[PDB]
Amino acid sequence: PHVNVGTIGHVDHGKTTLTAAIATVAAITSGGEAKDYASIDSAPEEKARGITINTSHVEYDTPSRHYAHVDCPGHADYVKNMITGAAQMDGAILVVSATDGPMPQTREHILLSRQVGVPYIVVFMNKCDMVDDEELLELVEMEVRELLSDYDFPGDDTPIVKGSATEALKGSQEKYGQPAVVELLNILDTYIPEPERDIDKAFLMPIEDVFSISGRGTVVTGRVESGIVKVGDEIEIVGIRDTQKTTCTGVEMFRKLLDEGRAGENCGVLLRGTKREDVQRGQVLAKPGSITPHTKFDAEVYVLSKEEGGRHTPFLNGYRPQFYFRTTDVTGAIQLQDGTEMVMPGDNVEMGVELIHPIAMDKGLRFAIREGGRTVGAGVVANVNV
Amino acid sequence: KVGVIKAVREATGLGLKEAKDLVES
Ligand SMILES: Nc1nc2c(ncn2[C@@H]2O[C@H](COP(=O)(O)OP(=O)(O)O)[C@@H](O)[C@H]2O)c(=O)[nH]1
Numbered sequence: 001p002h003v004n005v006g007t008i009g010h011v012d013h014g015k016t017t018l019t020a021a022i023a024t025v026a027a028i029t030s031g032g033e034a035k036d037y038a039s040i041d042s043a044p045e046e047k048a049r050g051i052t053i054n055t056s057h058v059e060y061d062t063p064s065r066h067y068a069h070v071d072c073p074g075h076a077d078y079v080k081n082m083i084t085g086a087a088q089m090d091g092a093i094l095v096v097s098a099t100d101g102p103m104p105q106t107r108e109h110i111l112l113s114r115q116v117g118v119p120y121i122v123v124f125m126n127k128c129d130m131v132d133d134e135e136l137l138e139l140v141e142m143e144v145r146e147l148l149s150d151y152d153f154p155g156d157d158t159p160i161v162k163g164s165a166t167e168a169l170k171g172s173q174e175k176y177g178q179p180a181v182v183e184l185l186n187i188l189d190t191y192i193p194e195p196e197r198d199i200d201k202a203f204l205m206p207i208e209d210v211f212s213i214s215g216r217g218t219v220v221t222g223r224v225e226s227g228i229v230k231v232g233d234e235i236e237i238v239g240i241r242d243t244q245k246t247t248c249t250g251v252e253m254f255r256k257l258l259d260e261g262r263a264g265e266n267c268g269v270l271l272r273g274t275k276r277e278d279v280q281r282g283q284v285l286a287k288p289g290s291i292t293p294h295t296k297f298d299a300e301v302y303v304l305s306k307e308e309g310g311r312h313t314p315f316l317n318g319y320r321p322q323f324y325f326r327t328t329d330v331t332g333a334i335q336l337q338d339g340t341e342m343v344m345p346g347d348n349v350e351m352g353v354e355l356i357h358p359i360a361m362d363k364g365l366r367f368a369i370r371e372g373g374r375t376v377g378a379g380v381v382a383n384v385n386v
Numbered sequence: 387k388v389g390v391i392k393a394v395r396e397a398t399g400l401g402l403k404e405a406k407d408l409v410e411s
């Protein structure tokens with residue numbers, strides 16, 4: 001199996017050093033590779049979807065499953081990676097320095113994980129080799145537990161493991177080194193449940209092109225991004241218009257029928273009864289009741305600074321840009337909260353959005369904010385309202 | 387003790403260990 005993980009926390013707390021530590025320790029039994037610190041600290045920059053991110057993509061595997069490990073060399077890089085969702089992390093290794101643990105970077109990182117929808121956080125504290133005492137370590141543990149509880153995370157039942165990344169790289173068998181990274185791997189292999197597959201999720205398929213075939217009905221094309229669609233499956237059309245019922249009467253690709261339409265492939269699907277003008281690009285096909293349309297929602301929005309292309313001017317309440325949801329752009333009006341009138345570029349906060357017409361969304365969906373074709377920010381849905 | 391240490395840390399912007407050392411001193 002495959003799982004995506006990453007180290008979050010305050011700068012200088014040893015996230016990169018710890019990532020190298022797991023790399024080298026997983027290199028035992030050749031599962032990983034002895035990884036140099038500098039190579040991973042030199043994260044390449046990719047300007048994907050008009051957004052530039054420094055991310056170091058570390059990879060390694062265990063007898064349990066393979067891990068995709070994510071590291072960023074700065075707070076802006078971490079925020080961009082979470083919100084643009086280059087690789088959704090279903091598990092986060094909160095790196096806490098044994099001294100000065102709960103810094104504001106960790107403060108905002110935990111909240112960002114909560115908003116973007118990271119389901120599980122595993123706490124690891126490093127720099128224990130610089131700390132000779134025990135009761136301040138316990139105080140730091142209590143602080144991080146309380147902070148996790150403060151943002152809907154378990155906290156009390158959150159596994160906390162203690163060690164030192166420098167000792168792990170050195171090779172010392174002292175409990176704060178290799179043994180520490182070894183348990184940390186154990187919690188990674190046990191506490192983190194196996195993530196759901198795309199083909200195992202509920203069926204969903206955004207509609208990109210609407211056809212019609214004589215004798216067959218209405219054909220809508222698009223890449224199925226979850227579940228499976230088969231002839232005889234009851235499906236519903238959700239999006240711009242009000243939800244309509246239909247039934248699958250055929251799945252075809254290149255004018256040839258398929259046994260079923262699986263997630264990840266650009267299959268076309270036939271609809272029963274629906275007309276060529278009763279459905280349009282932007283709507284999605286979903287299992288009945290799996291998703292619902294909404295115009296008002298609250299999202300974690302990162303405003304691109306001018307350095308990423310971005311935008312010269314700040315966001316403000318009443319700004320109404322275009323919002324892009326997987327196949328379509330829709331005008332939404334930015335609605336800030338009390339005490340947020342000005343929203344500086346390069347920052348990230350939670351805003352409410354009111355779309356001009358409903359879009360099939362649910363918590364965790366990601367979208368781009370643009371005007372004139374220039375990306376001015378990225379976002380992720382954190383709550384939907386009616 | 388924990389509350390005093392937290393207040394001192396918030397007031398002086400120092401680390402947890404430094405704040406605790408100042409509080410216990
Ligand atoms: N003694 C000790 N030093 C560490 C440890 N982890 C990190 N460091 C030092 O702290 C520096 C910064 O940590 P780093 O991994 O670069 O943090 P990041 O850049 O925010 O991901 C590194 O250059 C290490 O030398 C540790 O567990 N023990």
Ligand SMILES: [Mg+2]
Nearest residue numbers: 015016072073
């Ligand atoms: Mg780093």
